């Protein structure tokens, strides 16, 4: 309920005339232990699990004096994730232009 | 060009024609005159008979040089004459382009 | 860097709503009565069991061993945004064919194999295999969420 | 460096005209019939002998031992420029008195001495003296030039 | 009675009341640690709650806050607040 | 017809390997007129004026380096004499 319509962050207000409209989907990759991509983040080549913390964010933002080893969104966003194993390679292309969060969990 | 006059590529329509004024002054006993800034020249003013008069016309001279009577950025039309015996001053209250000639005897 | 300037997922209300859904049996399920198989795409209606909002799944096999999944509202109040100018062309399609059937699942074959997609109706799910080696599953953890456009206020 | 940007006196037409006048007998002459001793100044008409142009000389003795010489046209077609905002005040004047007079000259005394101004009528000339010591002369080389408005 | 003060460089020996009397009597400036009278003296900021610091004697009561604890401005019209945090 | 010897005292090559657009001498002395050696030099004679040496890498690079323009003789850039 809170923030589903009109929402404020710091001193800025989002009138959000359309209300909650988000979309989401999960994908399971059997045999995959290494995933890569979804730039841009000042983070490792091999993407980390997000279970204990923030998901990776894709939202083109100007971050003054950005720091290293964190999933904060930087200037660019390419919603493409690659999965590599000894046996195969796979890719996922999430063609969406809005703010996007990506969660990664191991098994 | 007493009336319409051009210098380089610039034209002066000079609608009122020649209107210049001039006057001379004699200073007996004086051998040293000073003043009429601004010029990149010595404190004691030189005679102008063999060359250019001192010019008073506020002008922006790029990379101006030394020891010449070319007009620089400011103009104070005041000349001081000094001798062992006396001191005198001349104040020429005119705001137009002014040339000053200095001759000895 | 000043990190209070930039939202966390908790401070992004849509991220907080989405991330609050926990792994379990999905409330979405496919109405196999609605299935239509064309040369270029398979369409099938989805329904949220609790809210009864109706979605449309467009499933496509593509040339060069690719699959495209598109999900929209069945009759939205207003059209939703579809990203232009990024794709350089209309992706060439590969034909889908029914090769396995029951009450709760449908198996489709892309062109002439070896890639097949099994659609389980309840709970809604998609699995992709080369022959019989499972490559990846969709909505297997039941985390799918599609906030339909609600009435303005 | 190439200084052709800026005029020499030869390239300034009024400087060229003026500087071509060389020391000699001046054609200007004071009309002593026109002399008037006013409260602040002495006025007297000057005339160019060849062109018959008429000028007005305003001669003033000032407090603090100063003399002011001003020359304008008698009947100008248009007013000439007089520099404003430079003088901080109207300079306090000292009374002038005729103390000598002959056919070709008038001697003036500032207040009660020792400064005196001798006006020579023909050719026009001015001499400034402390008692009997010549301090300075005006138009002694005959270089006065006043281009009237055509 | 009482004993006089001696400059640390050994320059001279002056009575105690010429210490911090706002006139420079020692060549090394050691007789005016609390004033601006000596050109080569130093003033010590204790700066409780931060790092202490020495400043030039010429910056004592110059109207500028040099110590974070503000003790260098005690008779200058500038009131310095404690900023050692 | 005698062969050429490099000035560094290293090796001896036939006359036809001088200015043959390949670097054969360690000091670059076999290609005074070309861009073939990385440490060679080209001499601008600059007839009537100050002469100058330039890097061999600036021979026929399309840029006018000598005031007499002789460093550009087969590059498509025509350099005029500016030694005045």
């Amino acid at each position: 309920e809170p923030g589903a319509w009109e929402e404020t962050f710091k001193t800025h207000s989002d009138s959000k005339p359309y209300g909650p409209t988000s979309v989401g989907l999960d994908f399971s990759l059997p045999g995959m232990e290494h995933v890569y991509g979804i730039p841009e983040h000042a983070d490792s080549l091999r993407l980390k699990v997000t279970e204990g913390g923030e998901p990776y964010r894709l939202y083109n933002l100007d971050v003054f004096q950005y720091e290293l080893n964190n999933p904060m969104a930087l200037y660019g966003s390419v919603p493409v994730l690659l999965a590599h194993s000894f046996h195969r390679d796979l890719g996922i292309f999430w063609l969406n232009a809005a703010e996007t969060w990506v969660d990664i969990s191991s098994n | 060009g007493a009336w319409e006059e051009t210098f380089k590529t610039h034209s002066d329509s000079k609608p009122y024609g020649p209107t210049s004024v001039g006057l001379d002054f004699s200073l007996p006993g004086m051998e040293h005159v000073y003043g009429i800034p601004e010029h990149a020249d010595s404190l004691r003013l030189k005679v102008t008979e063999g060359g250019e008069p001192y010019r008073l016309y506020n002008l922006d001279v790029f990379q101006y040089e030394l020891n010449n009577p070319m007009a620089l950025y400011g103009s104070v039309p005041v000349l001081l004459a000094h001798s062992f015996h006396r001191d005198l001053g001349i104040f020429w209250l005119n705001a137009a382009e002014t040339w000053v000639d200095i001759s000895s005897n | 860097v000043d990190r209070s300037n930039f939202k966390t997922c908790d401070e992004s209300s849509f991220c907080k709503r989405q991330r609050s859904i926990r792994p379990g049996l999905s409330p979405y399920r496919a109405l196999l009565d609605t299935l239509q198989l064309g040369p270029d795409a398979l369409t099938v209606h989805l329904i949220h069991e609790v809210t009864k909002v109706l979605l449309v799944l467009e499933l496509q096999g593509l040339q060069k061993d690719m699959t495209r999944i598109r999900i929209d509202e069945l009759e939205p109040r207003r059209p939703r945004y579809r990203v232009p100018d990024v794709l350089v062309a209309d992706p060439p399609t590969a034909r889908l064919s029914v090769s396995g059937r029951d009450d709760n699942s449908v198996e489709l074959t892309v062109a002439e194999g070896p890639y097949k997609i099994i659609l389980t109706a309840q709970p809604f799910r998609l699995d992709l295999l080369e022959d019989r080696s499972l490559l990846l599953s969709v909505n297997a953890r039941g985390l799918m969420a599609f906030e339909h456009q609600r009435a303005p206020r | 460096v190439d200084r052709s940007n800026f005029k020499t006196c030869d390239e300034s037409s009024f400087c060229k005209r003026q500087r071509s006048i060389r020391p000699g007998l001046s054609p200007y002459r004071a009309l002593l019939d026109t002399l008037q001793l006013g409260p602040d100044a002495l006025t007297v008409h000057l005339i160019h002998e060849v062109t018959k142009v008429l000028l007005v000389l305003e001669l003033q003795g000032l407090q603090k031992d100063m003399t002011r010489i001003r020359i304008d046209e008698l009947e100008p077609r248009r007013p000439r420029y007089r520099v404003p905002d430079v003088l901080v005040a109207d300079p306090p004047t000292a009374r002038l008195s005729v103390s000598g007079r002959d056919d070709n000259s008038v001697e003036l005394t500032v207040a009660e001495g020792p400064y005196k101004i001798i006006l020579t009528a023909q050719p026009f000339r001015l001499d400034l003296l402390e008692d009997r010591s010549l301090l300075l002369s005006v138009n002694a080389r005959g270089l006065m030039a006043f281009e009237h408005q055509r | 009675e009482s004993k006089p003060f001696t400059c640390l460089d050994g320059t001279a020996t002056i009575p105690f009341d010429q210490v911090n009397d706002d006139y420079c009597d020692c060549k090394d400036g050691s007789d005016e640690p609390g004033t601006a009278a000596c050109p080569n003296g130093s003033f010590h900021c204790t700066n409780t709650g931060y790092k202490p610091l020495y400043i030039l004697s010429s910056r004592v009561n110059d109207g500028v806050c040099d110590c974070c604890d503000g003790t260098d401005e005690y008779n200058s019209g500038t009131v310095c607040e404690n900023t050692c945090r | 017809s005698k062969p050429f010897t490099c000035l560094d005292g290293t090796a001896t090559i036939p006359f036809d390997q001088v200015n043959d657009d390949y670097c054969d001498c360690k000091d670059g002395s076999d290609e005074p007129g070309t861009a073939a050696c990385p440490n060679g030099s080209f001499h601008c004679t600059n007839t009537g004026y100050k002469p100058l040496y330039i890097l061999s890498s600036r021979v026929n690079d399309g840029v006018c380096d000598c005031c007499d323009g002789t460093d550009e003789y087969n590059s498509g850039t025509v350099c005029e004499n500016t030694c005045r």
Binding site: N60, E99, T100, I104 | - | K64 | - | - | -
Partner: protein, 597 residues
């Protein structure tokens, strides 16, 4: 049993996802490229070295920097002009005092065969005397608010409005603004840099535009945000193309980007910091971009913020020299760090790095042509080349260029050596500095000095080089080629080489290009056409061949179609098994073969 779960959550739009099934990683590259396109072929000069900072003060400063490179014997292709070159951050303008004659400045750079890049940001100063603002306002081409007014935020010029680059009429206007009649003072050797195109809004939420601003078609900014920058990049590149009549290839650097941005030019990692850890992270950041199609990637050499110590700057030049986009840049308050301002020992290490980059230009150009035609990344993680070596799956202090060069730059102060992992069960590796052969797979400890750049050539590859380093790439584009043949365990090798005029679309509109295949097997090196449709008039010839891992032949014979059989002189090093063939002298457009007898 091991499994990884991925979940995407987006604020609006539809669900639209492509599953790219491989099975190989190069299949995924092809699959994605068929969807979103391939890397635009960069003009050759843009693969050279770029010298930049905020800011070069005036035309005299730019010309002094240009002369400094020549006076200190360092190559450079482009000098960049940051925001202070314009009239108070009014883009498409020039400061009337410090840049009064842009055409004269550009002509002087052209006489040195160098280019210039000027920054053009998307935000437009709100100013009724600024013709750009008046036109966009009068034609309704600005991003809007819900009340129908033009959106106004704050950026470099103060109050500014934001063109709606999602509007096709706006992109057409922007493209036409780059014509030589509209962008007064510009010339064919002036290129463009798009910064702040996220868009950056200093007083906006998260330093960007409000979610409920309104764009073309009534869509909210929340719907389109992540493609706003791509549209800026696209419209700028299109303007550089049409200003030439459709002949010249563009160069545009962009900060913001999206899927498909590879089609419009280069990107870089933004405002980094002069620290060793920022140097290290440049590899994983550009590698993560390479994997998703953005091959033209780099980071600010020396760091944007703060002042790097001389040793860090040297190590950053060595790192940048082997990365796709090679530009030094610096913040307004940093000290000047043009490479000749350092002590002689640091200058020489930097010059050596610049020489290596310029010598490798034919190799870089060919890799980017293969990226342009196939969608294969230029900079590659080791696991892309060795998908079965699990010990490479996380490596990020190492990368490969194509399949031929493995790079492990020094990225630690005062390091005495590096640990280099040389993969491949059946592979051999040659240290390009010493020509020492190394067996794989192994972890080799290599001692380093300040001048060391650990680079290894893979056996079975042929690498083309321009060994005559000149002051810019334009000076070098007709020079002869040296071929470096690294022999495989089977005594084989192969490589490609792409050539064209270096800056036009003639390779595509007129098939005016060369694509050569060089192949070695047995004792024969053969040049053949890898694409017969391509022909090119060029003076480029083969001046030298260097073969690593070969024995001493008794005689070397060259055969070329149209020519009699010729004998070549050679030199052989028995210690390193290196054979140097002198002056083959054959045109690069000709079929030929060299036989070791």
């Amino acid at each position: 049993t091991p499994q990884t779960d991925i979940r995407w959550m987006s604020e609006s739009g539809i669900i639209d996802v492509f599953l790219m099934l491989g099975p190989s990683v190069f299949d995924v590259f092809r699959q994605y490229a068929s969807l979103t396109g391939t890397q635009a072929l960069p003009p050759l000069f843009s693969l050279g070295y770029h010298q930049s900072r905020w800011n070069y003060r005036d035309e005299a400063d730019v010309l002094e920097v240009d002369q400094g490179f020549d006076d200190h014997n360092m190559p450079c292709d482009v000098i960049w002009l940051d925001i202070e070159h314009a009239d108070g951050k009014r883009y498409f303008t020039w400061d009337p005092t410090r840049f009064p004659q842009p055409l004269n400045m550009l002509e002087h750079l052209a006489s040195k065969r160098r280019k210039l890049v000027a920054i053009v940001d998307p935000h437009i100063k709100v100013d009724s005397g600024y013709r750009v603002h008046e036109e966009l306002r009068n034609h309704g081409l600005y991003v809007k608010t819900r009340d129908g007014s033009d959106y106004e935020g704050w950026c470099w010029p103060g109050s500014a409005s934001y063109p709606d680059f999602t509007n096709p009429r706006m992109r057409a206007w922007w493209s036409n603004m780059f014509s030589f009649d509209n962008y007064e003072g510009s010339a064919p050797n002036l290129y463009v840099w798009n910064d702040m195109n996220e868009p950056s809004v200093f007083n906006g939420p998260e330093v960007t535009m409000l979610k409920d601003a309104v764009h073309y078609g009534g869509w909210e900014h929340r719907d389109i945000h992540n493609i706003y920058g791509l549209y800026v990049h696209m419209a700028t590149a299109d303007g550089l193309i049409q200003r030439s009549g459709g002949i010249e290839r563009p160069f545009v650097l962009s900060r913001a980007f999206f899927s498909g941005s590879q089609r419009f030019g280069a990107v870089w990692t933004g405002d980094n910091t002069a620290e060793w850890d920022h140097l290290k992270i440049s590899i994983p950041m550009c590698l993560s971009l390479a994997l998703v199609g953005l091959s033209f990637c780099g980071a600010d050499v020396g760091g944007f913020f703060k002042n790097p110590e001389p040793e860090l700057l040297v190590r950053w030049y060595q790192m940048g020299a082997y990365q796709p986009f090679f530009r030094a840049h610096a913040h307004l308050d940093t000290g000047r760090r043009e490479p000749w301002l350092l002590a002689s020992q640091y200058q020489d290490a930097i010059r050596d790095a610049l020489f290596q980059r310029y010598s490798l230009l034919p190799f870089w150009y060919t890799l980017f042509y293969q990226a342009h035609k196939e969608g294969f990344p230029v900079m590659r993680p080791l696991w892309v080349q060795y998908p079965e070596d699990m010990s490479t799956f996380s490596i990020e202090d190492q990368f490969m260029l194509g399949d031929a060069l493995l790079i492990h730059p020094v990225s630690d102060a005062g390091a005495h050596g590096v640990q280099v992992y040389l993969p491949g069960q059946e592979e051999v590796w040659y240290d390009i500095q010493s020509y020492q052969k190394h067996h794989g797979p192994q972890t080799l400890y290599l001692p380093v000095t300040l001048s060391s750049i650990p680079v290894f050539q893979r056996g079975g590859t042929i690498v083309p080089r321009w060994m005559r380093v000149r002051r810019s790439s334009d000076c070098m584009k007709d020079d002869p080629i040296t071929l470096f043949v690294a022999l495989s365990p089977q005594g084989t090798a192969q490589g490609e080489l792409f050539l064209d005029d270096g800056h036009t679309f003639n390779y595509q509109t007129r098939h005016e290009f060369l694509l050569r295949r060089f192949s070695f097997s047995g004792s024969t090196l053969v040049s053949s056409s890898a694409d017969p449709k391509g022909h090119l008039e060029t003076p480029i010839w083969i001046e030298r061949v260097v073969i690593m891992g070969a024995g001493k032949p008794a005689a070397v014979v060259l055969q070329t179609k149209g020519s009699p059989e010729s004998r070549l002189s050679f030199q052989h090093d028995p210690e390193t098994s290196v054979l140097i063939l002198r002056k083959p002298g054959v045109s690069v457009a000709s079929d030929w073969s060299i036989h070791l007898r």
